[PDB]
Amino acid sequence: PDSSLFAPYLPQANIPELIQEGRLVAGILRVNKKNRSDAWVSTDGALDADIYICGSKDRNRALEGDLVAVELLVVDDVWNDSDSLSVRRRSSLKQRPTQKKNDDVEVEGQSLLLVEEEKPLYAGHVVAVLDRIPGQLFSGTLGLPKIAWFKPTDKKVPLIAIPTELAPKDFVENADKYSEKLFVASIKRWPITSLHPFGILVSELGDIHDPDTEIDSILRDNNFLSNEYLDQKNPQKEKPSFQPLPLTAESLEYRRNFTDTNEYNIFAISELGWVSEFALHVRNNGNGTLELGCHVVDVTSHIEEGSSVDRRARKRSSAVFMPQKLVNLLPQSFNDELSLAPGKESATLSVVYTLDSSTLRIKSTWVGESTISPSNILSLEQLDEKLSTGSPTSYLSTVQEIARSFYARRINDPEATLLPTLSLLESLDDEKVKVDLNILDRTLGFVVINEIKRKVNSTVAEKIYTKLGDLALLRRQMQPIATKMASFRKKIQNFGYNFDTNTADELIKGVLKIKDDDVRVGIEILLFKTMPRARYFIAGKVDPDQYGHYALNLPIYTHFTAPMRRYADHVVHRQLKAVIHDTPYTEDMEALKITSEYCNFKKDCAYQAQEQAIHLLLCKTINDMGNTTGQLLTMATVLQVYESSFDVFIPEFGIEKRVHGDQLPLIKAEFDGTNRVLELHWQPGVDSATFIPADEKNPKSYRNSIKNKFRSTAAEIANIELDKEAESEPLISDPLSKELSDLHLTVPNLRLPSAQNALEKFISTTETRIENDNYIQEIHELQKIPILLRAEVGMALPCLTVRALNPFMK
């Protein structure tokens, strides 16, 4: 409690007992991307909150994602530059220091939404690292003489000291020549005697803004080398020896047969750019009951457990889906040969529900090995077409009503309709296969199939836990920590919504009740920020009272429906077959624990890769749409107001960003913390679109490294956009429009004022007043505001930035 020197770690042997006595508690370390000097350790229900870790010393060289042992401290013993900290109305304009402004543009701008942050109840320091996924990789840049400094693009990773004996030979002399090159590094050691970790160079990726390098860098930074199947002789191809194993007649005879096309009309579901791994049938049984059959490719029946393919697929762990590219879980030969197709007989694992034909209540459930021969194959796009423009009593209409009844029971709302849906909560559990430029996009067809798969996964989880108990591989998702729920509740209450938030049940119903699409999306964004992603886990390692999946309002869950892209499903499939055949399941609980946590690591990496690649292409699209103006102008909704800044979200783009007062031509600002109202005092006649803050002409400012420096006046942007609106003409260039079309992506739509010159149409949406020489604009939560939108180009990742239009411009 005096100096700032790292303490050596406690020996591993002591921790197990010390945890049992309550002297230490274990948890996962997460660094605050905004304020990197601090970190939190989340407990798996071992305490009422997260443990605050203040400063570098108390973090004791732990890294993001580490499992750490922490010793608690008196919060008082443990116990500024932010313009978003928020008696009555008072002057609050805050100029962030150059370094803080620079860091904010990256942290806020390099993700689609804004990360959340916020004397704590608990505080501690790290006394040991209990576990770390080994061999983690980091993309970044290298600069300068015995040490070269590697700067990770991941801002939760500290600078890494690279002994210059590992950097390229001619780097010490011309380090500036490599400033625009991307490297991959790893952390090798971090002793108490060094303020920084030491690491090694793994690869040189290439030019920082080369499109292929950009994607390769995203993959490597998220630990996807994607080399498990390549042939040494020829690297362009995969090793032909990797092939699915065919089934013997002994198995095929024993499977429940669904191949008679006179009795079952099975349609395989395909996803754009991906295989078909899920198929369905609906059948009238004739005795007042219906049947919904749910069929999943029986991947593991083609893979010998422990074989080379299994190990290499376990290493990959998750497929990766990006708008620009996809990376398989399995060898290409498996995708091609195992993808469900009409007329092709395929081994499957099926969950078949018998339903009351009038209420659709589930009368019974069958789970077992099967064989199908699809009669049809539909894409989700084709499913959508048929569900909107088709007979309201058709085959597919019945599937929708079944999905709706599953959904209504899941969220405990009998009258529930499948839309509106919660796209962000879905992403807490899984990633998109067909990726959209807007993370908010979900179609009815996807939701129908998704709610059926959620029921199937629920059924399989219940079955394997009942029979295998402590060895079951399950998936849970923890409710928001009390403090974050209390913050979320305060926000929606300020909005005027006072619905119950004590259970996922009532909270989700309150959100879904909101008629205003913008508000409903905004509140979902706020809710999404309070929760970490779901986690695979082994049942015996967790209290059975904490198996719940909060976001899905399910008491138990696992992953069974996507074995072609998730390795966890392979484990679940092998567990289900043991239960089916009542054979002894003899896997070590500790081995399964290591398997589940690795699956968590690679799956969260696949999620990060997907959103990073979306963000990259979206920034390119935003800049192409404003190719002549250097920026876009669109209506946005205010989500949160602070003393010197405010957050806006743009549902048409699926982004949430922060307007900073110190980047606007202001005289002052006043903040009313009781009413959540920020009053901007504008400089009359100064266009925000072209304003350069005085402090950003410093060569230390991020602005100096901006490559796309040109900004047109606001009037020019308004004119071009509104003229094109009436005309139904595109802002996007023809080359990029072709690119997005090939990728089956949709150009974002602007939100324009539906009202006079073009600029005046935007300005008339603002709430303004002139008090003598004060030119005041009021910023209210959930108000619409015109926002200038740009992607700053220059860093490894572009930075989205937003500015309020000056309503007192000429």
Residue numbers in the entry: 336 to 414, 485 to 491, 498 to 529, 536 to 561, 579 to 1189, 1194 to 1248
Question: From the publication, what sentences describe this entry?
Answer:
To better understand the molecular basis for the function of Ssd1 as an RBP, we solved the crystal structure of the core folded domains of Ssd1. This truncated protein lacks the first 338 residues that are predicted to be natively unstructured but is sufficient to bind Ssd1-specific RNA motifs in vitro. Despite the low sequence identity between Ssd1 and yeast Rrp44 or mouse Dis3L2 (22% and 27%, respectively), the structure was solved to 1.9 Å by molecular replacement using fragments of both Rrp44 and Dis3L2. The overall structure of Ssd1 retains the RNB family domain organization: two N-terminal β-barrel cold shock domains (CSD1 and CSD2) sit at the mouth of a funnel-shaped RNB fold. Opposing CSD1 and CSD2 is a C-terminal β-barrel S1 domain. First, active RNase II nucleases have a cluster of four acidic residues that coordinate a divalent cation required for catalysis. These are absent in Ssd1 (5), with the structurally equivalent residues being Ser704, Val709, Glu711 and Phe712; this configuration is unable to coordinate a divalent cation. A similar configuration is observed in Ssd1, representing a second structural change that contributes to loss of activity. This segment blocks the lower tract of the residual active site. We conclude that the S1 insertion locks the autoinhibitory segment in place, ensuring a fixed, inactive conformation. The CSD1 insertion in Ssd1, which is only partially assigned in this structure, folds into an α-helix that blocks the mouth of the funnel, excluding RNA binding at this surface. We conclude that the RNA binding site of Ssd1 is located on the highly conserved outer surface of the cold shock domains and is required for Ssd1 function in vivo.
Ssd1, a conserved fungal RNA-binding protein, is important in stress responses, cell division and virulence. Ssd1 is closely related to Dis3L2 of the RNase II family of nucleases, but lacks catalytic activity and likely suppresses translation of bound mRNAs. Saccharomyces cerevisiae Ssd1 binds RNA, but does not have detectable exonuclease activity. Transcripts associated with Ssd1 were enriched for mRNAs encoding cell wall biogenesis proteins and Ssd1 was shown to repress their translation.
